[PDB]
Design a binder for these strands. Structure first.
Ligand SMILES: [K+]
Ligand SMILES: [K+]
Ligand SMILES: [K+]
Ligand SMILES: [K+]
Ligand SMILES: [K+]
Ligand SMILES: [K+]
Ligand SMILES: [K+]
Ligand SMILES: [K+]
Ligand SMILES: [K+]
Ligand SMILES: [Mg+2]
Ligand SMILES: [Mg+2]
Ligand SMILES: [Mg+2]
Ligand SMILES: [Mg+2]
Ligand SMILES: [Mg+2]
Ligand SMILES: [Mg+2]
Ligand SMILES: [Mg+2]
Ligand SMILES: [Mg+2]
Ligand SMILES: [Mg+2]
Ligand SMILES: [Mg+2]
Ligand SMILES: [Mg+2]
Ligand SMILES: [Mg+2]
Ligand SMILES: [Mg+2]
Ligand SMILES: [Mg+2]
Ligand SMILES: [Mg+2]
Ligand SMILES: [Mg+2]
Ligand SMILES: [Mg+2]
Ligand SMILES: [Mg+2]
Ligand SMILES: [Mg+2]
Ligand SMILES: [Mg+2]
Ligand SMILES: [Mg+2]
Ligand SMILES: [Mg+2]
Ligand SMILES: [Mg+2]
Ligand SMILES: [Mg+2]
Ligand SMILES: [Mg+2]
Ligand SMILES: [Mg+2]
Ligand SMILES: [Mg+2]
Ligand SMILES: [Mg+2]
Ligand SMILES: [Mg+2]
Ligand SMILES: [Mg+2]
Ligand SMILES: [Mg+2]
Ligand SMILES: [Mg+2]
Ligand SMILES: [Mg+2]
Ligand SMILES: [Mg+2]
Ligand SMILES: [Mg+2]
Ligand SMILES: [Mg+2]
Ligand SMILES: [Mg+2]
Ligand SMILES: [Mg+2]
Ligand SMILES: [Mg+2]
Ligand SMILES: [Mg+2]
Ligand SMILES: [Zn+2]
Lengths: 49, 143, 155, 102, 53, 110, 118
RNA sequence: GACCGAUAGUGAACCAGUACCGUGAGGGAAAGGUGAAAAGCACCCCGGAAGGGGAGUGAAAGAGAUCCUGAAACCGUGUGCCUACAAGUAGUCAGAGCCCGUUAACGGGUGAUGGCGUGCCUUUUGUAGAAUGAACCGGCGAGUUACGAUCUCGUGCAAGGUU
RNA sequence: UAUCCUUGGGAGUCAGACUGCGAGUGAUAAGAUCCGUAGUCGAAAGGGAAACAGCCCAGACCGCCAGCUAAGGUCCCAAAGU
RNA sequence: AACAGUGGUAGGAGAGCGUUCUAAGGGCUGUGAAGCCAGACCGGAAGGACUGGUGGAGCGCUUAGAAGUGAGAAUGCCGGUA
């Protein structure tokens, strides 16, 4: 192998999803959280169970 | 490729229409079309391709039904309670040229070009007109 | 972050009535000179592959050097005087133009000193061989003693 | 003399020597194309097709295979975060009309 | 009462059509030849109506 | 040939200088000096000195006849603003822009 | 590592402003309003590429109707007669003849009249 | 140092816990860049000066002192096209006329006139909305990291795997 | 005709609206309210109903200065029958 | 090739663009780097070149890696200017 021609195994690495980076991505604005309520808030949602 | 008439290309005839015994609206609709140039195959929407129209015997225009008594020409002076009215009989007797002009103006396009198209209309009460110099042809309404 | 920035204790102005946007601290992140939201924090990037994967990696790159014909096995590498001119002459003698990893069995002082100043020439013991050094240097110059010492561990 | 021919799902009035842009034909620059469907021939000997003029052809030399000036198709819906940008360059064949064979 | 909308550059410029100085009501002094205001003493030479003031 | 003069960062508001400049732009330099002399405005003496400086540059540097000169360009650009504050009622301050002007005249031979 | 805002923002906004050249006042000058107008222009251009096909057909029909009536036919009857005769010359071409070669148009109108008078 | 690079990085790259604010505890800024070298513009000219035009220095002075670069808003000067009968979310499509001539393209600028057309965002059953937000421009400004859990995918080994 | 089921990963939603039809509440009032049922809007641009989320017609990958139709229209504004 | 499909909010899934830094390889640059300004060029989009001007010393490209990675709205913060 060469350091200038490195290649990962196919399906070993994916690009991370970055929310709140514009409408084209499909996670713009509300960042996949929908509208309002406890689940859309920072630190939101109820405890497990 | 579709040709477009322009100020250079356009050539306007002068037409005389006799209003005597003609129904106001039926005459008006045909004249409005001639002023717009709808009868010309060089008709172009954004320029005035139409012909000049002289109307004579405007006082002899006819109205069906009881429209002489019952058709009312309203206008408002933009002052409070400033709605004025004249009957069609009053219009035909005293303001026959305005009556035809009002009918035709309402049938022309609205906007700058429509206002320009109206300038080629010339309406006269009696039989005579002063446009001998323009050499006007008689135009019979198709109807 | 907003906690670690100097000052910023008080509410800049009252909640209501001023006509300004409500603000809680002069060091809130939207403020110039305010705290950073997230951003870098000290952390390690290290992780360990399974030992068998580590062995397969080193054997893979060593076996790759044999395929490419970038393996120069030496009978011995004994520089008498620790002199860079001599090491440079030996590398010219072996047609080693570009980078090279020299691999001795034990810690050879004279070889290590002589090669130290030549760009792109690293010296390691047999135990100090590693994937990145092997892959980064074109030629691999191993002594016979070192090959035996590598084969002791890996095989 | 002129002819009305059908090509590219459209009709074009052509004279001899005229350069015309039409929808992309499967041909190369230099090649001779023939237009079979001639709906009408004008000038002196007027021929009216039904639908086509029987035996009439128009031949033409292919000047260029190109793509037209770019259209940026941009569409959005107010208040719904729906934007859609799409470039378009429509292929054409530029032909010079050689001979109307009425 | 406050501006409901800001005034455009155009409208500001249209308003300033008449906000303009006039050229002084000036004539050549018959004594010294400098320009003076008509019906005023010439500041340069101090003359008015062919008389030193 | 052209001769230029500039008065940079003169303490007069650009709008006020431009009123007077509009009177002299295009004019023959003799006529311009007369207009400025008889225009009762704060900008007049300032603009006069720039005009006379440009005329002197034309004579001395470029060897141009002063009687044949015309104002070919004349304009006021904005200089840097001196920011001040006026105490208003109720303990409020309101900004005062003490504006400056760069005043350019270019004279050329007719 | 820190990524500064850098040049990407200026480059993107400037392209929008160049698309807004010729727009009135602040619409060619300020990014926010230029952006809105370029977006609106997209919606309008898409709509009007469709309306263009309607407007030209409307224009050709008007011209064919005028020429037809010079030959003593309405547009309605002319097109019926052309359809019965199997003439497939489209409205663009018929309107082209109506303006450019009216004698050729009249032959097609005569062909239509022949079918109608059957 | 796969840390920052002057709105960042310390509050503080600079005479900063200063200036300034507060009776006090206390709060707490802004502000980096001439040039390789001062060679920091002798001298002449307008001006009281400021400032400028030459001249000289310099590779460069449109590097001449908050003096590298020098965006945008914003303010001006000049003028190619249009504009004083017009009803305008300002564009878009159609389109003469006039003026140009390119990354040479079924080109560029302008736009008489015609058709169509109630900004953007947020929030809503529904907003051109007479609901909300933004004066404008620029910069900065929001799902991160650690350690656990789980699933998918990948790789090694496999009834073993792993420290 | 090409859906359906199971298991596992990830959601969002829990203010609905009008229209037709079947009911309640109301006064067999409400652009009212509350259910059932179908549609459209929501999340759907295009044509028609002057304008007009919810009606009528119809689902916009993109280009064309081709053609045929839908609702609705064909004296003039305004395309097509005085 | 043929056949079929391609409106879309919340939202799921995929493929990409660009930014800073690092590694390796290979380059550019005082015969003018980045930045900036202009243009009638190119790509399905994000975007990318080319030419000229300014600028006066740095910077691409390829493959992989890592993120302070993309702004038009927060009565956002700071500055400038209306
Ligand atoms: K989600
Ligand atoms: K600070
Ligand atoms: K201008
Ligand atoms: K228009
Ligand atoms: K309110
Ligand atoms: K119902
Ligand atoms: K450059
Ligand atoms: K972030
Ligand atoms: K803001
Ligand atoms: Mg979505
Ligand atoms: Mg948004
Ligand atoms: Mg929200
Ligand atoms: Mg809710
Ligand atoms: Mg929710
Ligand atoms: Mg604190
Ligand atoms: Mg900080
Ligand atoms: Mg007081
Ligand atoms: Mg950095
Ligand atoms: Mg930014
Ligand atoms: Mg159609
Ligand atoms: Mg800086
Ligand atoms: Mg700081
Ligand atoms: Mg004190
Ligand atoms: Mg410079
Ligand atoms: Mg330098
Ligand atoms: Mg500078
Ligand atoms: Mg006028
Ligand atoms: Mg009038
Ligand atoms: Mg409500
Ligand atoms: Mg309003
Ligand atoms: Mg609210
Ligand atoms: Mg507001
Ligand atoms: Mg802003
Ligand atoms: Mg319900
Ligand atoms: Mg209800
Ligand atoms: Mg049921
Ligand atoms: Mg909703
Ligand atoms: Mg649906
Ligand atoms: Mg509709
Ligand atoms: Mg409508
Ligand atoms: Mg809506
Ligand atoms: Mg039909
Ligand atoms: Mg009609
Ligand atoms: Mg879809
Ligand atoms: Mg579809
Ligand atoms: Mg997703
Ligand atoms: Mg950089
Ligand atoms: Mg360049
Ligand atoms: Mg960021
Ligand atoms: Zn005197």
């Amino acid at each position: 192998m060469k350091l200038h021609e490195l290649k990962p195994s196919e399906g070993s690495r994916k690009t991370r999803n970055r929310v709140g980076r514009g409408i084209g991505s499909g996670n713009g604005k509300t960042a996949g959280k929908g509208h309002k309520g406890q689940n859309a808030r920072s630190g939101g949602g109820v405890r497990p169970g | 490729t579709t040709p477009m008439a322009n100020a250079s290309t356009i050539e306007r005839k002068w037409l005389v229409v006799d209003a005597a015994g003609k129904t106001l609206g039926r005459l008006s609709s045909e004249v409005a079309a001639i002023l717009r140039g709808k009868h010309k195959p060089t008709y172009t929407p954004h320029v005035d391709t139409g012909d000049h129209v002289i109307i004579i015997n405007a006082e002899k225009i006819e109205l069906t039904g009881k429209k002489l008594t019952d058709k009312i020409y309203y206008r408002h002076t933009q002052h409070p309670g400033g709605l004025k009215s004249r009957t069609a009989l009053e219009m035909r007797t005293n303001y026959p040229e305005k009556m035809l002009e009002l009918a035709i103006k309402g049938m022309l396009p609205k906007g700058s070009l429509g206002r320009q198209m109206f300038k080629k209309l010339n309406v006269y009460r009696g039989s005579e007109h002063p446009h001998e110099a323009q050499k006007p042809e008689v135009y019979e309404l198709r109807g | 972050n907003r906690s670690e920035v100097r000052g910023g204790g008080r509410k800049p102005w009252r909640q209501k009535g001023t006509g300004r946007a409500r603000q809680g601290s002069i060091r809130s992140p939207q403020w110039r000179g305010g705290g950073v939201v997230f951003g870098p924090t000290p952390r390690s990037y290290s992780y360990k592959l399974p030992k068998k994967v580590r062995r397969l990696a080193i054997k893979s790159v060593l076996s790759s050097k044999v395929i490419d014909n970038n393996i120069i096995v030496l009978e011995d590498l004994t520089l008498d005087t620790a002199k860079t001119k001599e090491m440079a002459a030996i590398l010219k003698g072996l047609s080693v133009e570009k980078k090279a990893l020299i691999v001795t069995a034990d810690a050879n002082e004279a070889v290590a000193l002589s090669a130290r100043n030549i760009p792109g020439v690293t010296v390691v013991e047999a135990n100090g061989i590693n994937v990145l050094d092997v892959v980064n240097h074109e030629k691999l110059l191993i002594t016979k003693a070192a090959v035996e010492k590598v084969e002791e561990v890996l095989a | 003399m002129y002819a009305i021919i059908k090509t590219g799902g459209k009709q074009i009035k052509v004279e001899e020597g005229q350069t015309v842009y039409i929808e992309k034909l499967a041909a190369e620059a230099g090649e001779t194309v023939t237009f079979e469907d001639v709906l009408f021939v004008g000038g002196d000997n007027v021929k009216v097709g039904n639908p086509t003029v029987e035996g009439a052809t128009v031949t033409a030399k292919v000047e260029k295979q190109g793509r037209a000036k770019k259209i940026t198709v941009f569409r959005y819906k107010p208040k719904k975060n729906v934007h859609k940008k799409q470039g378009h360059r429509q292929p054409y064949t530029k032909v010079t009309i050689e001979k109307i064979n009425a | 009462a406050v501006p409901f909308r800001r005034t455009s550059k155009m409208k500001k410029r249209l308003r300033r059509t008449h906000f303009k100085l006039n050229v002084p009501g000036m004539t050549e002094c018959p004594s010294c030849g400098e320009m003076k205001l008509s019906h005023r003493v010439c500041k340069a030479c101090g003359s008015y109506n062919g008389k030193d003031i | 040939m052209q001769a230029k003069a500039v008065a940079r960062t003169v303490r007069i508001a650009p709008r006020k200088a431009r009123l007077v400049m509009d009177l002299i732009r295009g004019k023959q330099v003799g006529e311009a000096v007369s207009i400025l002399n008889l225009t009762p405005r704060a900008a007049s003496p300032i603009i006069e000195k720039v005009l006379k400086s440009a005329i002197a540059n034309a004579e001395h540097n470029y060897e141009m006849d002063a009687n044949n000169l015309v104002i070919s360009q004349a304009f006021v650009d904005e200089g840097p603003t001196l920011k001040r504050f006026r105490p208003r009622a109720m303990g409020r301050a309101s900004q005062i822009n003490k504006r400056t002007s760069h005043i350019t005249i270019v004279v050329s031979e007719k | 590592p820190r990524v500064k805002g850098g040049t990407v923002t200026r480059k993107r906004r400037k392209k929008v402003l160049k698309l807004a050249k010729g727009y009135f006042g602040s619409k060619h000058t300020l990014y926010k309003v230029a952006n809105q107008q370029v977006m609106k222009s997209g919606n309008y251009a898409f709509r009007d590429r469709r309306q263009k096909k309607r407007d030209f057909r409307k224009l050709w029909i008007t011209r064919i109707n005028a020429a037809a009536r010079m030959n003593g036919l309405s547009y309605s009857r002319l097109m019926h007669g052309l359809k019965l005769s199997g003439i497939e010359v489209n409205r663009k071409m018929l309107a082209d003849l109506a303006v450019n070669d009216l004698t050729a148009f009249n032959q097609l109108a005569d062909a239509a009249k022949a079918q109608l008078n059957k």
